[PDB]
Design an enzyme around this catalytic site. Structure first.
Site, PDB file in Angstrom:
ATOM      1  N   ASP A 194       0.791  -1.310  -0.035  1.00  0.00           N
ATOM      2  CA  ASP A 194      -0.182   0.053  -0.051  1.00  0.00           C
ATOM      3  C   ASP A 194       0.690   1.213   0.080  1.00  0.00           C
ATOM      4  O   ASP A 194       0.985   2.111   0.977  1.00  0.00           O
ATOM      5  CB  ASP A 194      -0.836  -0.174   1.242  1.00  0.00           C
ATOM      6  CG  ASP A 194      -2.460  -0.580   0.939  1.00  0.00           C
ATOM      7  OD1 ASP A 194      -2.254  -1.541   0.142  1.00  0.00           O
ATOM      8  OD2 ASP A 194      -3.247  -0.151   1.467  1.00  0.00           O
TER       9      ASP A 194
ATOM     10  N   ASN B 150      -2.953  -4.483  -0.935  1.00  0.00           N
ATOM     11  CA  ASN B 150      -4.266  -4.657  -2.045  1.00  0.00           C
ATOM     12  C   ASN B 150      -4.260  -3.528  -3.003  1.00  0.00           C
ATOM     13  O   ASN B 150      -5.011  -3.913  -3.846  1.00  0.00           O
ATOM     14  CB  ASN B 150      -5.303  -4.866  -0.959  1.00  0.00           C
ATOM     15  CG  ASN B 150      -5.520  -3.662  -0.202  1.00  0.00           C
ATOM     16  OD1 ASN B 150      -4.761  -3.286   0.441  1.00  0.00           O
ATOM     17  ND2 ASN B 150      -6.742  -2.985  -0.221  1.00  0.00           N
ATOM     18  N   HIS B 151      -3.637  -2.481  -2.741  1.00  0.00           N
ATOM     19  CA  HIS B 151      -3.676  -1.425  -3.673  1.00  0.00           C
ATOM     20  C   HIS B 151      -2.510  -1.457  -4.795  1.00  0.00           C
ATOM     21  O   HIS B 151      -2.797  -0.748  -5.744  1.00  0.00           O
ATOM     22  CB  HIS B 151      -3.586  -0.155  -2.833  1.00  0.00           C
ATOM     23  CG  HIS B 151      -4.581   0.436  -2.066  1.00  0.00           C
ATOM     24  ND1 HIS B 151      -5.311   1.501  -2.422  1.00  0.00           N
ATOM     25  CD2 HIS B 151      -5.315  -0.309  -0.932  1.00  0.00           C
ATOM     26  CE1 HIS B 151      -6.367   1.701  -1.467  1.00  0.00           C
ATOM     27  NE2 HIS B 151      -6.275   0.750  -0.593  1.00  0.00           N
TER      28      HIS B 151
HETATM   29 MN   LIG Z   1      -4.490  -2.175   2.615  1.00  0.00          MN
HETATM   30 MN   LIG Z   2      -4.470   0.435   2.998  1.00  0.00          MN
END
Ligand SMILES: [Mn+2]
Ligand SMILES: [Mn+2]
EC number: 3.1.3.16
Lengths: 60, 580, 290
Positions: free
Chosen positions: C80, C112-113
């Protein structure tokens, strides 16, 4: 006089140890049951009448 | 036929991907160059003007393109042909496109010659200001400052009349734009014309129903005051400033407060002494916290700029009690804004006034709960030091700052470190060892790396001041102990300390005390410590004696340059080259 | 080649982006370096673990001022690095440059980004367009994001990771067996490692997000026991104090983005692990911006 506009949703979740069986999902039957209650309320919330719903929980 | 660049090959690029449209607009120079300049003016620009699009980014790029279209349209002579499409862009609802269009319009204004400015640009300004939609009316405000200097006097009087009408318009945002552009527009006018036309309408703007227009009026008040002769400000600007400073809205009073110093500079000292200091007083004593904070940061700049003959009298009679009440303000932002400038009053007031009046205020702010207050106070310690000497510093402020060497926020401790060389340079070895040497050592084991770095760099200045015997007796033993530490951060800290200490400790101390400790860390299990050992041996190479290089430093670097970690190899071989 | 990299790092430390060709060559080198890394990277004990940065470059500079400069301090970043921040490009470019320059001193995991969809939606794509005028830099970085390791393993005890655990993953061998070269899926073993969160519940649960699972203390206990772990280090969730212990010290969340969306006012922490796995959290506040 009587409020029928506030339905009661009693959930009788089986908490016997047999609900520790694992599905092919990798989660237990109890996890599936909790997810089922959550999904049920997510689906119910789409109805505007869902406000005032009484949710109850009883176990084994 | 589908090969005409003007209509075809352009209106086919209306696909879903906006980036293709921006690319087409970005490369609008190439299509224009392909077309004849006469053909461009005849067919391209009317197509741009007549058609209306609905994407903000394409419109912004189009407006940006038209500012540099003078070469591709036929030179400055025919530059007036760019006015319709930019006019269409100046009437759009989106504000950013309007501002870019106004910027392009005033950029191509320079391309016009006076005759063309009067023939084409001034009618365009009249149309924009006279438009049915208020967007064009706000757009017209920014166009006055570039057309005005290079037109005939009758046209200048007309421009003044339309700006006055625009300012007095019923529409709010038109008045906002007019008030915003009033400062720039009044810059170029004739002074008598400023008094006759700008000033009455400016005073009308300051007394408007809306508050945003009043805010922009006070914004422009500084420039308007700066323009006028000093003999006229008592009757022209000062009543308006008095009206504004007492306005019901706190935004207007706030932006009066930020602009106060420039007002002071503009109107001249005697007018400030007579009329500004009650305005400053009730700005500091104001109910709202925002305006109090805005006024607090202007205290030093205001007081420093007064006439020295009547300066201290003003400060203690009007400013100082208000400062005393601001130091205990409920809002921490007000206290922080006051803290950043309060020490600047020390040279102005003098030594005895600072001790009797300012020093308790410093002490109160040094023990504040808010970290911003404590941080802002310490940063300007040199001023009070130079004013009151160091005997009074040791008496009053030293116990307070020693308490701040263990502050929760590390920037406070950083400020204290940054202010240790001054104190050291002004204090003896005995007193510094009694009070502050342990403080200098306590920071080397700090959690924050910036604190450890600052303390390491501070050791160099401390050794420069108090000599290397003092370092050998007090500094070195506590540094060497950190080499045996199980945390590799502290071992690296000793390597950094040795880096800065070899320069000032001389050849002998570096050779016999520091080098054997540096060499034994080559067998460290942490690769970071190992390549920092390589870096240190590179750095302390010049200040070592030349005899121990090949005998002692070189074998260790040879062992390190075949190490398993690639970084250790790299820094060891860099050290090997630098050693030559 | 190394001198130019050092120049880029010096430049990037001042918040000046690189050119497109520089980003292309940097991402080429980073791809050829990140090919060799396993899904579960092995990190030696002295390391500083950091949570989400999310493009807050000046907060990353504050992080370096707190924990130390690379390469002097070994850093583990748990994903992230982009979105929800104004300087995503500079942040991710600096981290990738540090990875290329200092291979063994920097560990950058996948958040997750670090995916095409999330970057498209949440402003890394927009930032790349604004700062370069074409999506080629975004293409290079998103192709590079597929190369990032999913998890790390400090000392064999601490299991660093971005999201959390999966019902389909019981062992670290499963994680090592995954094919990470792909866009992060909406469902499956790889999604949960980047999207799951711990919870005060029993067993598994449906994540309030659209992806991942939410797992209780017993899940992390069984995972730690089965895999011989003492701790699951983590990111992916805002922590007001910067770090928070969960599940009877089985899981710890670390968030390294103070004042997260420039409005949350949170602290930020980093877990400094020394040579003997003695930890210490360095909480820090957002930097003073000019
Ligand atoms: Mn994240
Ligand atoms: Mn985050």
């Amino acid at each position: 006089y009587f409020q029928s506009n506030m339905p009661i949703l009693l959930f009788l979740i089986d908490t016997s140890a047999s609900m520790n069986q694992r599905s092919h999902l990798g989660t237990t039957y109890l996890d599936t049951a909790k997810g089922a209650v959550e999904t049920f309320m997510k689906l119910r919330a789409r109805d505007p009448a869902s406000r005032g719903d009484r949710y109850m929980l009883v176990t084994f | 036929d589908s090969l005409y660049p003007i209509a075809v090959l352009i209106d086919e690029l209306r696909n879903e991907d906006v980036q293709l449209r921006l690319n087409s607009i970005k490369k609008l120079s190439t299509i224009a160059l392909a077309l004849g300049v006469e053909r461009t003016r005849s067919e391209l620009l009317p197509f741009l003007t007549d058609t209306i699009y609905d994407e903000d980014e394409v419109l912004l790029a189009l407006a940006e393109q038209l500012g540099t279209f003078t070469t591709l349209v036929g030179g400055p002579e025919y530059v007036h042909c760019l006015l319709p499409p930019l006019e269409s862009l100046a009437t759009v609802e989106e504000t950013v496109v309007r501002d870019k269009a106004v910027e392009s319009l005033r950029a191509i204004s320079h391309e016009h010659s006076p005759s063309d400015l009067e023939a084409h640009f001034v009618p365009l300004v009249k149309r924009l200001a006279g438009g049915d939609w208020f967007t064009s009316r706000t757009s017209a405000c920014g166009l006055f400052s570039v057309c005005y200097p290079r037109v005939s006097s009758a046209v200048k009087a007309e421009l003044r009349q339309y700006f006055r009408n625009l300012c007095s318009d019923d529409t709010p945002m038109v008045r906002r734009a007019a008030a915003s552009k009033l400062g720039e527009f009044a810059k170029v006018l004739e002074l008598d014309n400023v008094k006759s036309e700008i000033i009455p309408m400016f005073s009308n703007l300051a007394s408007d129903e809306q508050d945003s227009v009043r805010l922009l009026a006070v914004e422009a008040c500084v420039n308007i005051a700066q323009l006028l002769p000093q003999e006229d400000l008592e009757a022209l600007v000062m009543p308006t400033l008095r009206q504004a400073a007492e306005d019901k809205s706190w935004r207007v009073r706030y932006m009066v407060a930020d602009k106060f110093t420039e007002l002071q500079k503009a109107v001249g000292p005697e007018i400030t002494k007579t009329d500004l200091v009650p305005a400053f007083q009730n700005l500091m004593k104001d109910c709202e916290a925002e305006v109090r904070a805005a006024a607090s940061h202007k205290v030093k700049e205001f007081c420093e700029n007064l006439s020295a003959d009547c300066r201290e009298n003003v400060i203690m009679s009007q400013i100082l009690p208000c400062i005393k009440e601001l130091v205990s303000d409920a809002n921490q932002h007000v206290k922080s804004a006051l803290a950043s400038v309060i020490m600047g009053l020390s040279p102005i007031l003098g030594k005895d006034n600072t001790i009797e009046h300012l020093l308790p205020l410093f002490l109160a702010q040094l023990k504040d709960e808010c970290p911003e207050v404590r941080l802002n106070i310490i940063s300007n310690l040199d001023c009070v030091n130079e004013v009151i000497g160091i005997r009074q510093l040791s008496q009053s402020l030293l116990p307070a700052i020693v308490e701040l060497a263990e502050d929760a926020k590390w920037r406070v401790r950083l400020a204290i470190i940054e202010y240790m060389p001054l104190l050291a340079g002004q204090l003896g070895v005995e007193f510094f060892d009694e009070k502050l040497n342990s403080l200098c050592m306590a920071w080397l084991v700090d959690h924050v790396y910036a604190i450890r770095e600052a303390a390491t760099s501070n050791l160099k200045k401390l050794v420069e001041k108090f000599g290397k015997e003092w370092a050998h007796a007090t500094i070195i033993p506590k540094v060497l102990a950190m080499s045996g530490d199980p945390n590799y951060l502290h071992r690296m800290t000793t390597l950094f300390c040795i880096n800065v200490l070899s320069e000032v400790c001389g050849q002998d101390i570096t050779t016999k005390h520091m080098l054997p400790t540096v060499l034994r860390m080559a067998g460290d299990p942490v690769a970071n410590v190992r390549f920092n050992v390589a870096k240190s041996l590179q750095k302390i190479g010049p200040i070592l004696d030349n005899s121990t290089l090949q005998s002692e430093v070189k074998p260790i670097l040879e062992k390190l340059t075949q190490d398993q970690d690639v970084d250790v190899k790299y820094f060891a071989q860099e050290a090997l080259t630098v050693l030559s | 080649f190394t001198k130019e990299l050092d120049q880029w790092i010096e430049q990037l430390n001042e918040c000046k982006q690189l050119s497109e060709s520089q980003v292309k060559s940097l991402c080429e080198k980073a791809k050829e370096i990140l090919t060799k890394e396993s899904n579960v990277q092995e990190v030696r004990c002295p390391v500083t673990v950091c949570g989400d940065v999310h493009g807050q470059f000046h907060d990353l500079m504050e992080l370096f001022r707190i924990g130390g400069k690379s390469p002097d301090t070994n850093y583990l970043f748990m994903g992230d690095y982009v979105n929800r921040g104004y300087y995503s490009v500079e942040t991710v470019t600096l981290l990738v440059a540090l990875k290329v320059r200092y291979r063994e001193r920097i560990t950058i995991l996948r958040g997750n980004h670090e995916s095409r969809q999330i970057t498209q939606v949440y402003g890394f794509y927009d930032e790349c367009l604004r700062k370069y005028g074409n999506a080629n830099v975004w293409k290079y970085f998103t192709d590079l994001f597929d190369y990032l390791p999913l998890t790390a393993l400090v000392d064999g005890q601490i299991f660093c990771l971005h999201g959390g655990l999966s019902p389909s993953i019981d062992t670290l061998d499963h994680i090592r067996a995954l094919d990470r070269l792909q866009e992060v899926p909406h469902e499956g073993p790889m999604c949960d490692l980047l999207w799951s969160d711990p919870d005060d519940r029993g067993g598994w649960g449906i994540s309030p997000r659209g992806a991942g699972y939410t797992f209780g203390q017993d899940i992390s206990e069984t995972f730690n026991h089965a895999n011989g772990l003492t701790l699951v280090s983590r990111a992916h969730q805002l922590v007001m104090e910067g770090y928070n212990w969960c599940h009877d010290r089985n899981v710890v969340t670390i968030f390294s983005a103070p004042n997260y969306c420039y409005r949350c006012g949170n602290q930020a922490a980093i877990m400094e692990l020394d040579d003997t796995l003695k930890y210490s959290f360095l909480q820090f506040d957002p930097a003073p911006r000019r």
